[PDB]
Short mmCIF file of C-alpha atoms in Angstrom, two decimals:
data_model
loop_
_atom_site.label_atom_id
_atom_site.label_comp_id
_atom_site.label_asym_id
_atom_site.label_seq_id
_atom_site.Cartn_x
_atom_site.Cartn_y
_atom_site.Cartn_z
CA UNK A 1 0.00 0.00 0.00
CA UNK A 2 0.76 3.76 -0.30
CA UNK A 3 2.26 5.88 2.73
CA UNK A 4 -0.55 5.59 4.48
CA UNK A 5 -4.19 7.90 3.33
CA UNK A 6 -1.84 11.00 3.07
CA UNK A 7 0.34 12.70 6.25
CA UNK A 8 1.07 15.99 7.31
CA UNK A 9 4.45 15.33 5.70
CA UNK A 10 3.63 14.57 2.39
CA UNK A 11 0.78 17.25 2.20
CA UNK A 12 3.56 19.25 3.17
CA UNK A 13 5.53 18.50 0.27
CA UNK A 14 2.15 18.68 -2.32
CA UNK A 15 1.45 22.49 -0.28
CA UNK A 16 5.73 23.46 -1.44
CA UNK A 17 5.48 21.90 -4.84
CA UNK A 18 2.47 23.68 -5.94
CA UNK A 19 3.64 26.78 -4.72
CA UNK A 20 6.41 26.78 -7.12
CA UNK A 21 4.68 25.26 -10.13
CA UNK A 22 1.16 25.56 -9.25
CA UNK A 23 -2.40 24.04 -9.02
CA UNK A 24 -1.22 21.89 -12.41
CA UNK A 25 1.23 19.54 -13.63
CA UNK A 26 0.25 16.85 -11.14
CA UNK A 27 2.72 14.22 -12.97
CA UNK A 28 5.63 16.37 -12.03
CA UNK A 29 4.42 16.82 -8.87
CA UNK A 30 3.70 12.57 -8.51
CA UNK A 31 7.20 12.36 -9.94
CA UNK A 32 8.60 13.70 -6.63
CA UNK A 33 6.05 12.23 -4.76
CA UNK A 34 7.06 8.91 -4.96
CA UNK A 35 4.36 6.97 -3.98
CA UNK A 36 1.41 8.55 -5.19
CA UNK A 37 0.16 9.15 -8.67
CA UNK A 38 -1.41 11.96 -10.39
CA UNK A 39 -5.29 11.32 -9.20
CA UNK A 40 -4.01 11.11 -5.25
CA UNK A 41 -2.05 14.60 -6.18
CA UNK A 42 -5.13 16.13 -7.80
CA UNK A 43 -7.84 15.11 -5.25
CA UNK A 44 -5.86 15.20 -1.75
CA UNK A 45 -5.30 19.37 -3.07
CA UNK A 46 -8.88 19.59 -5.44
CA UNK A 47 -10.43 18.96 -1.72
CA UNK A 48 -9.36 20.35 1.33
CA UNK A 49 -5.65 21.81 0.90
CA UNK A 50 -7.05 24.68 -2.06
CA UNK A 51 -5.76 27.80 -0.48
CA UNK A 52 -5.15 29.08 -4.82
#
C-alpha cells in the first residue's frame, strides 16, 4: 500500500510543490512524490488543501 491515506508530511511536500509550479502539472508533482500518482495529487489538493 501507499504511505498511508496521506500525512502531514507529504501534504507538506504537495502544499511546497504547488507553490512553485502551481495548481497543475500533477505528474511532475507525482514524480517527486514517490508513492502517489497523479489522481491522489489532484484530489488530496482539489479537496481540502485549495488555499489558490
Amino acid at each position: 500500500l501507499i504511505k498511508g491515506p496521506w500525512t502531514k508530511e507529504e501534504d507538506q511536500r504537495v502544499i511546497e510543490l504547488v507553490q512553485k509550479y502551481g495548481p497543475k502539472r500533477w505528474s511532475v508533482i507525482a514524480k517527486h512524490l514517490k508513492g502517489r500518482i497523479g489522481k491522489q495529487c489532484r484530489e488530496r489538493w482539489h479537496n481540502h488543501l485549495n488555499p489558490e
